Amino acid sequence: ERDAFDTLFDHAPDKLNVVKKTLITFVNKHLNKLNLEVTELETQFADGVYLVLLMGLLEGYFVPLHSFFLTPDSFEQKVLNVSFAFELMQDGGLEKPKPRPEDIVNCDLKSTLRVLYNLFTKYRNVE
């Protein structure tokens, strides 16, 4: 089950900052268009909102308003948002993400990086 992010955190932790930064630049390439900004991947994807918005921007979806919570007020809502974002990733043709939606909400860095990198790999050429 072991991947490159396991190897990164175990053996090359000083390479984490360039990994963060490249992914931050990628997400803000799209989120800036909505006047939104990510400063830190540790916490700012946990409520599931930006992941949903990002998928809308990347695939050009008509995202149904009643399919996610724009201002989630609980663990469970934040849980429905990430799951819906995962749903939209798979709708575009991506494999089901490795992390459970709860791992994102609980601010697991590896899980956050994995989800964002797989979007980077697919959508790095999208203007």
Partner: peptide, 12 residues
């Protein structure tokens, strides 16, 4: 070769 591949994407 996964870490090599990962860093070629994100160190470019």
């Amino acid at each position: 070769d996964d870490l090599d591949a990962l860093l070629a994407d994100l160190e470019s």
